[PDB]
Symmetry: C2
Subunit: 408 residues, 2 copies
């Protein structure tokens, strides 16, 4: 069996010599200026846990920060609120951290008094780390809420079942909810999985999720009333699939913006969107001829299949963002088996693509565009979401606990 | 400020340090000290962590140091009789700016496992300085001192240090100093490596590996080093006024050029035994469409005023050429260099395109194009062949190198 240590201070944690299987229980209460360094090494069989006595009842206020530094560690039930970080990211997974996890935890309005002061709320480094059943809400200052920092090897991190709540408009770039990589690391493989999360009113900037590395999967998430887009910003071989981007008619709600090579966009429900051009439900950007990593790379071989676009201002925009510098149009790939209904502009072409196969796309538009057919394959509407009658399913957020287990 | 006297890493953690304060670590041999120097100072009043008596505060066993914050100074520490279990021995974090480590040493601080990777000093952040230190005897995987690149130039300064004997590692990753990696090679670094001694640094082919741009390696001594100073990745680097003195030692190489807009001037490259990639001045051949971790074509190298003497091979244009590396050096010049008592003045493995070779002087009977007989008077002063009108006492003869207490 394992030892159980009952503590109420970072100083007591620092004095423990933790072994695989140990559990450190942080007592219920409101503790200020806590500098928590969870530095220990567990094993697959015997993880080292740092848990709140009662989930959501151990609150870290003032200038509190958490560092997870080791292998097979688990942090569970903590809340950061009524404070801010003076410098470091609120929660950090070190580069030497692997197979570690933070669960049932929250960061709420943990804002620096200075809006221009940059820190992230959660930073992922190392490999096979997991962020699940957490709540990150109300960031008003500079910096992406949750970042995956890329390194020379893929991370294979998992970000699942979290609630990312309202994030107000930052007014400048760096207000993303999730950023996976940077331009410098954009040609590296990341393999991050972003699954079954809720992004509710994440309005920090243009990008809600900014992908800037390769082989990432954004699957089965809900983006509800988000003033922004899911952007394939830099990198190749990314997948954005089975997500519900429900704008609910909200001003400037955008869809999936495609930049770069070999990307797959499939099975998404892109409805109630108010965006156009770069904010269309499916936006396939124009690009530069000889770009630097931080610029725009030509869309090559996009595979856009089975997406249901409905009740939106603009369905697909091919060549969006075209100008004097960005003259390269999308090329290769296919735009097929999609459905575009009750949409003011079904398909706009700002830059004619090359070899992009457009076929079997059902629409209710009076003037059928090139590559589109008439709606006949039953499109039903269960839970305010226009779905295919035989593919009707209960959306993951109606039957799964998203955010901390102790919270409702 | 206040003078805090401590004898433990835990004691330092309990202090609320303010600008101008000084922490004095007690003389003695302290085992397994995990030192976390997290504090902030100012330009006028820095926070100092100093040994009670320089060189008499030893950290043995599994001891590490982290310098985390602005305007911090670490002084007089010795790391020996131990090893790191994972982390780099001395680390400046990314949040560290205007901080310094002086009069400190890391000696035979080796892991029992030759394959276990950690660096002895890692530089992150901005405007940090490593000076008057001694780093000697690394036998395990990993470069001795690393400059880790980030999105902004660091402008670090590495000066007046003694990098002592480093035995041959057997594999790559045995450099003395590496500035950057292939991923960050197109970023500007602006690191200055100046007035250091590299003595028998034999870890691998690269004593210094530049893998970022705008770095300057100036006025250093490379004495009996089994390796080269390589411009490995990146552009706009400078290797100047250095003394590479092989003393005839097997495989002592010179300066190896790869990439664009590099300047190699005023170097004294003497008693070298290398050839090909280890020639006194090697100008590599490269791939046509290289990825960042490969070889970029030498474009516009400016090689001037170097004095090559008593060596096996002077200049190798097109060194390393094979089926993959076919692109030869192009543009720039090779002028006003001297090649005396050297078995091969110039070896051409790949004819350069538009490389101007002119006004180079040699004592060789057969003159290559761009070469003339030695017209200027040369003197051998302090063991080094120099122009009689340009004689200077080498820096290491008139400056303290390494810790002041040693």
């Amino acid at each position: 069996t394992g030892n159980i240590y009952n503590i109420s201070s970072a100083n007591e944690l620092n004095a423990l010599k933790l072994q695989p299987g140990d559990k450190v229980i942080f007592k219920k209460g409101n503790w200020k200026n806590q500098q928590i360094n969870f530095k220990a090494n567990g094993t697959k069989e015997k993880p080292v846990v740092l848990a709140a006595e009662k989930g959501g009842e151990t609150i870290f206020s003032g200038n509190s920060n958490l560092k997870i530094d080791g292998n097979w560690l688990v942090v569970d039930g903590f809340v950061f609120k009524d404070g801010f970080s003076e410098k470091a990211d609120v929660i950090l997974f070190t580069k030497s951290t692997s197979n570690s996890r933070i669960t049932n935890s929250s960061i709420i309005n943990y804002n620096h008094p200075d809006k221009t002061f940059d820190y992230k709320w959660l930073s992922l480094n190392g490999e096979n780390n997991r962020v699940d059943h957490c709540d990150f809400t109300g960031k008003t200052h500079q910096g992406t809420t949750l970042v995956v920092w890329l390194d020379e090897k893929p991370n294979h991190h998992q970000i699942d079942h979290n609630y990312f709540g309202p994030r107000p408009a930052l007014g400048v770039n760096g207000g993303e909810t999730i950023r996976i990589g940077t331009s410098t690391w954009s040609m590296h493989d990341s393999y991050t999985l972003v699954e079954n999360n809720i992004f509710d009113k994440c309005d920090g900037e243009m990008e809600i999720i900014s992908l800037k590395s390769g082989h990432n999967t954004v699957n089965n998430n809900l983006f509800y009333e988000c003033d922004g887009t899911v952007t394939f910003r830099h990198g190749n071989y990314n997948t954005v699939s089975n997500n519900y981007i429900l704008g609910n008619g909200k001003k400037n709600t955008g869809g999936i913006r495609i930049i770069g090579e070999n990307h797959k966009v499939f099975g998404n429900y892109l409805q109630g969107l108010d965006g156009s051009g770069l904010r269309a439900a499916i936006s396939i950007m124009s690009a530069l001829e000889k770009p630097q990593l931080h610029e725009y790379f030509q869309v090559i071989n996009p595979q856009i299949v089975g997406n249901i676009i409905a009740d939106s201002k603009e369905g697909i925009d091919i060549g969006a963002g075209k100008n004097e510098k960005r003259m390269l149009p999308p090329k290769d790939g296919f735009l097929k088996n999609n459905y575009v209904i009750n949409t003011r502009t079904v398909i706009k072409t700002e830059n004619e693509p090359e070899g992009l196969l457009i076929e079997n796309n059902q629409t209710d538009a009076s003037s059928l565009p090139k590559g589109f057919t008439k709606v006949g394959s039953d499109l039903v509407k269960s839970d305010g979401i226009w779905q295919k009658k035989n593919d009707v399913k209960t959306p993951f957020w109606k039957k799964e606990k998203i955010g901390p287990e102790w919270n409702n």
